Amino acid sequence: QYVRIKNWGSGEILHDTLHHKATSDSCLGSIMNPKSLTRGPRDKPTPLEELLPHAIEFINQYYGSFKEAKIEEHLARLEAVTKEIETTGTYQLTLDELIFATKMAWRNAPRCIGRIQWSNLQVFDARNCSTAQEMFQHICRHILYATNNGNIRSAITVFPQRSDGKHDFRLWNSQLIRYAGYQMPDGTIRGDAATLEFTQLCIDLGWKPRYGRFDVLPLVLQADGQDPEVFEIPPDLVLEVTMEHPKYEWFQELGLKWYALPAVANMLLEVGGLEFPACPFNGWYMGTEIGVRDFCDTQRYNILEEVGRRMGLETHTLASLWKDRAVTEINVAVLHSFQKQNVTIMDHHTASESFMKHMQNEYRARGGCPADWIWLVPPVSGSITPVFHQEMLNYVLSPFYYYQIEPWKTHIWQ
Amino acid sequence: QYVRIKNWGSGEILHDTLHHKATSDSCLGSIMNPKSLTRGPRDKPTPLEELLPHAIEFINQYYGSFKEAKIEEHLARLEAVTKEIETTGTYQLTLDELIFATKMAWRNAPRCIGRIQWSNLQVFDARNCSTAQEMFQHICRHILYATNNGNIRSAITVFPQRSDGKHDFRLWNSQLIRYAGYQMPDGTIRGDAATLEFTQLCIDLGWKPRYGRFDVLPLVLQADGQDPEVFEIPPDLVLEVTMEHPKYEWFQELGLKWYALPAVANMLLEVGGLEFPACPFNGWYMGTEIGVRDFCDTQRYNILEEVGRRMGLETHTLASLWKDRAVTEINVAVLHSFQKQNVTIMDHHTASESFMKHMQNEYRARGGCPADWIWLVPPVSGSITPVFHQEMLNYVLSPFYYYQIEPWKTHIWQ
């Protein structure tokens, strides 16, 4: 009938009607959460006829990897899995297979710039997990390991796969560590405005609202199918960096800081027909994530106004390019503060250059590299970056990290 | 078989093979010159059966415009055109129809941010033109009018439409005014490196190589079907702005400048089945075009290296964000210099805000707005801009400004 279009800044929604008068030649590239990138719920297992080929394909992928293939084991695994599939329905992956799966899924993530590190990933096997509290422990082990007291390490903790579709392990948080956002009495908004709805959710499940600008939200976990059990993260585990500029001593007066761990929580790992709706992973920050998006987005902390004022710029004259000046200084603050406190981070330039190197390796190696330009190009200094001038094809392979429907919309309340 | 992917920075070409292993869910959005945005040559006229409906549709569009429609004239025009179509094959548009066509084609240009000015356009009817020299005169009239001694005016000069396909009027230049690029003896490159091949072409047609950094290229025109006649643009017509920073007095020592007129030459106007392969149009510059792309691209003037050095930044340390600092200063130089010399220009921020306003008007009005995010988001300070957070659908409507195959690849040499 029509296509929905949302503005993530003002949150406004529009309905596109014109597209119908298009030519006999409509890219959805600009869309954030397209259905083609999401993998929703279920009620029944994966039909054998689908599951089987996917499984075989995957096993062919894996065994087709290593130099000098283990043909016998290849055939054996193929045979063993086929058997296991007909006997149980679903099937279990050899640890070394998961490792390969997680790395390939990352390698296949078109919206990630850090993919040159695809082979350096730590996998935590939590497939035998069965309770929320047990998830919580694995997560803490994850956060602890990843943080490594500043020297951030990329890792992913894979929880139990999907069985029937009503026994899903799910983290309700956007990311492992994330600040809270409260709509205060005086009409304002404190904290991360992006985590507004979710915070209310935590509140609704009896969470204690600490009402600040940097209150780390609680881990909302759900095991098997059972309702979400709220767990607060041990503050000793949450490492942070206090923001301070190398020249503007007044910058620390802003009382700004941010967590050192960028760990995605709510994504789904698809591999060989199987799907793990819970498998938080982490890399390390890229300056612009915090400096540009987190701190300067209208929908987030929105600090541009005053960083500009405090810099003495003509904040009431767009043409003065003060926003360009401020943001840059915020970016250095972040980079400086992370560097100073020995917490891993990479600026957007060195990051882009390494990605360009990644593609070169990728194309020469497997002949391609799924890339989402819109996501790969840094939120600032676009063309100054190599990736801006690089043409790319955005396509979904397998294994893959799909988005998924926010669990609180599709959940049972017993 | 495979998809070609080019890096417009290093000029390197890659062949994507992986895309074939895609999912049963490949956006070409990142591609610069896709076939779906181009309108190539011909050998025969437009088959009546195609031409007719398009024509009717267009006339329906036009007459469906004005408040209180001229039904009788609508029917009459429909009837008159149908007749004219069967009698001649092709047909001629009423001036007021072209005006409407050019504005809608602009209104339908998904890669333009200045579309809020869509209704303020000047049309020069050169459909009765028949010789190169005559084109040259119309062009000069265009350049003169558009420039308006700084107070730039948006305008388009429409040359004769397509007849059979071997009698095409074509401007061989990328844009009306454009500097030359020469690959010098000492291995270097002077001028606009982007206009390298074309400059050689001008040279090949006996053009006098003035060997500088800012030598305005000659107008290479072709009428009917006859070969391209080289015409040099009268220097009095070419208005320029000398670059100078409001604080860094050493900036003018760079001896930088740029033309004030951004006029696209090589595009094709499609309307009601008809197609005008020659119809240069112009708006006014947006700072970042010059400051970021023209001056800071590796493939262009590439001035980042020394603007940084002269600023005293740590040019050998990417993490210092010197590139972010330099570019910003170059942007102000441009904006300042244009403002100082009373030459119309708009910064990227005020531009984006006006586009956001444009969409609002557009959606509410006709229910849509073809937009190419990749092109609409400024080459710097992306997320600081509203359009970055705005989801959009990129689709081809009609009328439209298509790209076209560089004429020197597909031309007769008598």
Ligand code: HEM
């Ligand atoms: C090692 C350093 C890494 C860096 C520098 C890096 C950086 C980034 C950046 C800049 C983004 C965009 C974030 C945003 O705008 O929301 C991103 C997205 C993404 N990254 Fe990477 N990443 C890294 C590691 C990883 C790892 C280890 C995985 C998975 C195993 C991964 C998976 C993804 C996925 C799926 C996305 C898309 C997230 C979404 O759609 O919201 N990244 N990454």
Ligand code: HEM
């Ligand atoms: C009045 C002020 C205008 C402004 C500020 C403006 C600005 C821009 C900018 C920033 C671009 C991108 C240029 C590039 O990166 O190469 C662009 C592209 C474009 N503009 Fe607008 N424009 C204006 C007027 C016009 C007019 C008057 C027309 C046509 C009647 C037009 C047609 C287009 C088209 C077709 C493109 C795409 C060019 C291409 O594909 O290479 N623009 N414009």
Ligand SMILES: C[C@H](O)[C@H](O)[C@H]1CNc2nc(N)[nH]c(=O)c2N1
């Ligand atoms: C609407 C638009 O697609 C959206 O704001 C984008 C653009 N590109 C992005 N790129 C990255 N890296 N991260 C993002 O959140 C976004 N958001």
Ligand SMILES: C[C@H](O)[C@H](O)[C@H]1CNc2nc(N)[nH]c(=O)c2N1
């Ligand atoms: C390869 C990539 O599409 C290309 O470099 C782009 C991106 N977006 C752009 N946007 C604008 N406005 N102008 C451009 O030339 C480009 N080029």
